[PDB]
């Protein structure tokens, strides 16, 4: 059949991958991969060893693109006395620097600018092309901390203001408030299904959310700026009483704190009524889906969080889904 | 302020009349209510669009 | 309300002899078609009648797709239906009585074309507007062959309770 | 078999793959059905429950005896290795679609020289759509395309700063007016609420009236209609809804009387409105079982006739040509739903039984449930002990 | 705002949905009935 | 035999449950439960649908109160291509709240006091009845973490005091020094180890 997958490591096509698998999930900075290999050996013959630690990756899923790397961010080479000798690789994001490097700010501390002007300084020392379509907010004080890694940083500040953080199937950063909004499919049970294995659970929701937090702006300070600035937001989903507090890490503003407090309700939210479906045959995440699941009654429209094809050699090509209301 | 001029419905509606008559019922008009007549009013709406 | 709540109508159906006879010196056979009925000063209208045996005619009188062979077909005459491209029942129209070929003794031949005949005429009930169909054949020598073709059907208001079966969908036609 | 008179060759179909014929020697299957049995503990009585079909699967055996079987036989192992399923004539399934999954041939040369026999192992293959299920959906309407188009046309003409001076306090009060029927609609829907949120809204309604110039823009006037409807759908559930909605059709019903723009700038608001409520009061009839087929039509004509007469309007003279293509797309989308919703919901069909009887005995025969009578009662007139002699019930499915 | 060519399959349910509902109140389009010829018919002169 | 288990869920029996377990750990704060349930399905027919997020549930073993939920404090339904398609259930303590919800003291800081008189203040939130048999203790000073946990702080305030804190079997909160008492079986290998 047309090939339904297909793999591009620096140009030159891998054409004996026995097996893949690509993972991209809402919740994280970057997605990945593991593609396994073939590798042979004759004694006392010659032996050409790639071993590039590090190149571009590109996985087509379907005569589309899938994954951007960036690529060959591991090498293992497994063996073994009986059943063979093979190799493993493994690939993430354009971001992969952000996550595990330092940052080397100029300064280390903001005057006055907004979250934008921020996030654009502090990335751009590592050549990543940024990809906004949120609302820009102004704050009075940042101090980003001294050798905290960026992955801590943005998304730190991100949750604050309530904004999504994670990758596109292109090599950008796509901050995002809400969905993509690209209609999907309507999953329906006895047609596509294979599990779903759907939950729910009351450990992880509170009906009623407060926040607190000083201010920091030159002209405010005293009773203004200590014992004013507290918000309260409910969810009204839950019936019953489950009080929690928190504490707000920035220069407190009753526009942010509600901001910070419904941030924690999509999240809480979503973790309760995790779904987890698996669809056989081989688009993106934070599409939007209709389900319908009669012996549990869901009838919803669902937001889709992560993503995920798995291959193997012999009876497996799956895909998995991790929805959200 | 149409720019494709559009006769009077009544003329069209008995253009369709004539010609479906002329060609599978053989020159007889259509009884009032019956498959014809709906199969005919609905080429109209057709036309329309 | 009144009871007649069944608003569901009934379209042209194709009928036997509706177009005379053919003779000739070998026999007399029908020729199908539409009919036409007149009213009293004109109007002209089409006969609605016997819809389940107007649509057996049409699965009978149409060749199907035809089987890859190897050497080819001209593309004039490959058989089958354009617009099957559409239909979500996965099945094809028309029908293929048409493709047998002489195998073995006569009596092997018709045996076979009594097969095909209860294979095409099978999709009946899967439209649900019959409940069971069965063809018997008699061969009788050289020249003299039959085949009858039966063909059960329902009313259309239930009268029957605690059927094995289940009652045919489409029934609106009752018959 | 039974009698003398068999002919084997005229009983069993040749075997074949791909068009490449072949010599059968056997031919087995194997069908069933999915189970999820389970028995509970302590307990004398156990279940049971469906979870589908099982994948069949084909098993044959070939034998090679003509002349140079060696090339025959080394000939036909080119097929079955060859990319993808296809067409296999069984000799007593017929012709289905399978996918070969192994053969091991067998043959010698002091043995037996002269004939090599293959086993086969088929299964059965049908064809998929590579996007893991585009099947369409056929339980709700969708509003997002129309609203969005009437959205364009009321701003189009309605522009109260443009039309001419003395007639734009009229304009304007008509618009206000057609808020308050919105409002007047939602507080008889939640008349038993009191939640904290029901006191937002009122103090919302009551703000955006008092103002007098929120109804200068034509931004600020379209909003204000489309989140109003949009409220008063989600009060109330059902039937609660079909008086509120027909009176602010009534109320729309009305044609302007000024001339040249101001009367577009007028008959915008009630062509506007009367859509929006057409729109709602279809999904209206959606959440509600249709208690007969006569009636479950008989609500959709009611429906295809406010539209067909919007559209109309709108191509009377070209005023509007898109509107008037968006309007009968929608039209025929409606059908689509209403007409499956009477036909097919709950899958009425009439009954002749032999005379009158009471509910609880037709409920009994027709089902075997005599605790199901309740239904009857909607659908069927009559008292509960003369119901008869013709019923009107669901179809049974076995 | 923008309207553009239908797809094939969305056009021909336009049709048969048209067809059904006003001239058949509401019946089914049983396949190979002279119904069905009349319906693909007029979706071809419809994409031509 | 006469049922040596039965369990409860707002007042109706289950009488399909395929398994069970239950726990109760002196070393915490709350017991647990959980349940295995079938469930069936029919195409095209009617389903009727619980999913009782919030109830309680009671478990007897032997003709013996054994666990006071407060129940369905969990709902997951699992479900095969092959061997079935099921449910699950779960269940914890009476005190579950103050296990999971943050407290919301009147000020944060008690001037002089016991700690009696403030666990109290504190579980009497959400109406949890005590059972304090312990000898009571006069704290100077006593000022709770701000928006800390019901758990953490009555664990942290009865370490230094050598106070149990775990449940009974009746929904209650029991406050212990030292063992109940209750003197059990002689279990002798040879004759019920396994």
Redesign the interface.
């Not at chain 3, 709540?5 to 194709?14: C, H, I, L, P, V």
């Not at chain 3, 004109?42 to 089409?46: C, P």
């Given at each position: 059949m047309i090939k339904p997958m297909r793999i591009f490591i620096g140009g030159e096509e891998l054409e004996t991958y026995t097996s893949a698998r690509l993972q991209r999930t809402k919740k994280q900075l970057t997605g990945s991969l593991t593609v396994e290999i073939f590798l042979n050996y004759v004694p006392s013959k010659p032996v050409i060893v790639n071993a590039v630690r590090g190149k571009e990756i590109l996985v087509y899923v379907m005569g589309e693109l899938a994954f951007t790397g960036e690529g060959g961010s591991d090498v293992t080479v497994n063996f073994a006395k009986g059943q063979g000798y093979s190799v493993t690789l493994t690939a993430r994001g354009r971001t992969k620097y952000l996550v595990d490097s330092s940052h080397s700010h100029p300064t280390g501390s903001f005057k006055d600018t907004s979250d934008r002007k921020v996030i654009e300084a502090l990335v751009k020392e590592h050549k990543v092309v940024l990809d906004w379509q949120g609302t820009e907010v102004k704050e009075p004080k940042i101090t980003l901390r001294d050798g905290n890694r960026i992955f801590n940083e943005i998304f730190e500040r991100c949750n604050q203001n309530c904004h999504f953080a994670y990758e596109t199937r292109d090599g950008k950063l796509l901050v995002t408030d809400g969905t993509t909004g690209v209609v999907g499919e309507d999953i329906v049970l006895g047609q596509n299904i294979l599990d779903f294995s759907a939950e729910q659970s009351e450990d992880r929701a509170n009906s009623e959310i407060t926040v607190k937090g000083h201010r920091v702006a030159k002209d405010v300070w005293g009773k203004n700026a200590i014992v004013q600035p507290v918000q309260s937001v409910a969810d009204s989903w839950v019936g019953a009483n489950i009080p929690l507090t928190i504490q707000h890490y920035g220069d407190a503003t009753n526009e942010s704190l509600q901001r910070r407090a419904k941030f924690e309700a999509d999240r809480r939210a979503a973790e309760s009524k995790s779904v987890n479906v698996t669809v056989f045959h081989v688009w993106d995440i934070g599409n939007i889906h209709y389900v319908e699941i009669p012996p549990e009654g869901i009838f919803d429209v669902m937001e889709c969080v992560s993503l995920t094809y798995s291959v193997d050699a012999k009876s497996t090509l799956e895909t998995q889904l991790e929805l959200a209301p | 302020a149409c720019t494709i001029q559009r006769p009077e419905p009544q003329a069209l509606r008995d253009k369709i009349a004539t010609r479906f008559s002329t060609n599978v019922l053989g020159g007889a008009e259509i009884i009032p209510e019956s498959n014809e007549f709906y199969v005919v009013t609905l080429e109209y709406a057709m036309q329309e669009e | 309300?009144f009871?007649t709540?069944?608003?569901?109508?009934?379209?042209?159906?194709?009928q036997v002899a509706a177009c005379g006879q053919s003779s000739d010196d070998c026999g007399d056979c029908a020729r199908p078609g539409l009919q036409?009925l007149?009213?009293g000063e004109?109007?002209?209208?089409?006969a609605?009648d016997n819809?389940v045996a107007?649509?057996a005619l049409?699965?009978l009188l149409?060749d199907a797709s035809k089987a890859?062979?190897?050497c080819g077909w001209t593309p004039g005459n490959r058989g089958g239906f354009w617009?099957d491209s559409?239909?979500s029942?996965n099945?094809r129209?028309?029908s293929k009585i048409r493709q047998v070929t002489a195998r073995?003794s006569m009596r092997?031949t018709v045996?076979?074309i009594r097969a095909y005949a209860i294979?095409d005429l099978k999709?009946l009930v899967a439209?649900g507007?019959a409940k069971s169909v069965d063809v018997d054949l008699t061969y009788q020598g050289s020249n003299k062959i039959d085949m009858t073709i039966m063909i059960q059907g329902v009313?259309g208001?239930?009268?029957r309770?605690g059927l094995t079966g289940?009652?045919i969908a489409?029934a609106?036609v009752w018959s | 078999m039974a009698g003398p008179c068999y002919n084997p060759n005229e009983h069993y179909l040749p075997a074949s793959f791909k068009g490449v014929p072949f010599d059968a020697d056997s031919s087995d299957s194997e069908h069933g059905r999915n189970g999820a049995e389970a028995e509970f503990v302590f307990g004398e009585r156990t279940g049971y429950a469906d979870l589908g079909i099982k994948i069949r699967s084909y098993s044959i055996r070939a034998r090679f005896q003509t002349n140079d079987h060696v090339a025959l036989s080394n000939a036909f192992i080119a097929v079955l290795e060859s990319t993808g399923p296809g067409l296999l004539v069984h000799p007593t399934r017929g012709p289905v679609m399978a996918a070969c999954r192994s053969a091991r041939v067998t043959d010698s040369k002091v043995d037996a020289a002269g004939v090599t026999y293959i086993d086969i192992d088929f299964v059965e293959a049908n064809d998929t759509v590579t996007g893991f299920g585009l099947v369409g959906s056929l339980i709700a309407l969708a509003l997002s395309p129309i609203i969005t188009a009437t959205e364009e046309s009321f701003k189009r003409y309605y522009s109260p700063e443009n039309v001419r001076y003395y007639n734009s306090e009229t304009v304007i009060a008509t618009m206000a007016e057609a808020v308050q029927q919105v409002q007047t609609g939602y507080l008889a829907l939640s008349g038993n609420d009191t939640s904290q949120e029901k006191w937002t809204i009122v103090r919302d309604f009551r703000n955006v009236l008092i103002d007098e110039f929120t109804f200068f823009d034509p931004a600020n006037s379209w909003n204000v209609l489309r989140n109003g409807f949009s409220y008063l759908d989600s009060a109330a559930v059902g039937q609660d809804k079909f008086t509120i909605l027909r009176n602010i059709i009534n109320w729309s019903s009305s044609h302007s009387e000024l001339d040249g723009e101001s009367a577009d700038a007028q008959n915008a608001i009630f062509s506007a409105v009367r859509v929006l409520a057409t729109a709602y009061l279809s999904k209206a009839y959606m959440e509600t079982v249709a208690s007969t087929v006569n009636e479950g039509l008989a609500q959709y004509d009611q429906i295809a006739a406010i539209l067909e007469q919007e559209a109309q309007i709108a191509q009377e003279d070209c005023h509007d040509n898109e509107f008037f293509l968006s309007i009968r797309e929608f039209s025929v989308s409606v059908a689509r739903v209403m007409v499956n919703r009477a036909y097919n919901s709950p899958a009425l069909i009439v009954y002749s039984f032999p005379g009158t009887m009471h509910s609880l005995v037709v409920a009994w025969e027709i089902f075997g449930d005599a605790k199901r009578s309740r239904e009857l009662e909607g659908r069927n007139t009559g008292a509960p002990w003369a119901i008869g002699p013709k019923v009107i019930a669901e179809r049974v499915r076995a």
């Open positions: - | - | 309300n009871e709540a069944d608003r569901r109508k009934r379209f042209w159906t194709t036409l007149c009213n004109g109007r002209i209208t089409i609605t819809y107007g649509l049409n699965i149409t890859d062979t190897g617009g559409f239909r029942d099945m129209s028309g073995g092997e045996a076979l294979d999709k439209y507007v009313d208001n239930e009268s309770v289940e009652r489409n609106w | -």
